[PDB]
Symmetry: C3
Subunit: 146 residues, 3 copies
């Protein structure tokens, strides 16, 4: 997946950013079984004051996660995954859940490219990864945290 | 809603950001009935020159509004809303309509969370809000201009 | 289309941004027939270190292209287009293909506005353009490289 995470500049330290990325990555892996290295977390920082809620300028505490997924998962699982992102990002960023918005968008795997390759259908990541070249598997496997 | 608004840095001063965000917010409430406080307008600024149209580098006037909505509204209503955003952002930003791009994407409400809560189906915002906890209600009601 | 291109700050010089924007734009016009000036390439730069893959902080080499399209093209065509974007961005940016991610989202043309006007269905780009006003066509025709 690609998780676009919109946050205010300097709201999250380098350590907090690593924690939030790990919370999202672990939630995705844990609930979908997709490999660690396929989860992209992409932080989009903007100055505090660039978020408005009901026309009211906000401080630096809003977090919007825009998750870009393949089609094919159940509403039940998607709901579990959004709730776990809310809960675990709240802990990782030390931020009240009321500040956290989470939207999942879905597209056919056939129009979705990670690491320059077209994605498989959900749940068939094993078939897919076994079909990757040695160099691609090696590059992929370095993008997993200890 | 979440409206991602992609603009060149400083094209909208702080007060113009407020005017643009209030115009989008009012248009969304006016045409859908969704409370003011559910409208998020999230300004994404980039240096001028990062926008290309037909391969040609642009100055600082293009505005792209990417609206993320719940599924469930009619094509007619979404057309009216997109036109009003074009019209009312043109006035708030004092910018030519020909600089304004607006795309709406839709998702099932069941995979959409505002303020840490899953959204209801469209015209159901009232009962949904009433059934939130008292602290949640109080927090969103601060976010009304 | 609107192509949001997420890159690290200073990874692409102005020359390389132009080459990347041209590669995507040529790819889209060449496989869809849509006119040049309708392809927006919108570079979103962030400090290197804001991209994580599997929890690991990245350098400045990742590129994510989020293309936002009208509904109605075949999966075959979309696959050809995504692949050409991988290939031609890899050359233009001098970056390995393994660093490049490309997702396409699609939306009904009726909730999609370029240059302040609603888009037509794919393939109808010529008739739509002729119905626009002289000043709208003049503005758009300057956006061809």
């Amino acid at each position: 997946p690609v998780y676009m995470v919109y946050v205010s500049q300097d709201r999250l330290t380098p350590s907090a950013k690593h924690a939030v990325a790990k919370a999202i990555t672990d939630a995705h892996r844990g609930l979908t079984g997709t490999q660690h290295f396929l989860a992209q977390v992409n932080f989009q920082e903007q100055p505090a004051g660039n978020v408005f809620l009901g026309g009211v300028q906000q401080g630096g505490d809003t977090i919007f996660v825009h998750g870009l997924h393949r089609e094919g998962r159940s509403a039940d699982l998607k709901g579990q995954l959004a709730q776990r992102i809310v809960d675990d990002v709240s802990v990782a960023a030390e931020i009240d859940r009321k500040h956290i918005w989470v939207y999942f968008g879905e597209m056919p795997a056939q129009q979705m490219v990670d690491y320059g390759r077209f994605l498989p259908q959900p749940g068939h990541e094993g078939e897919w990864f076994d079909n990757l070249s040695s160099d691609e598997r090696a590059f992929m496997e370095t993008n997993v945290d200890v």
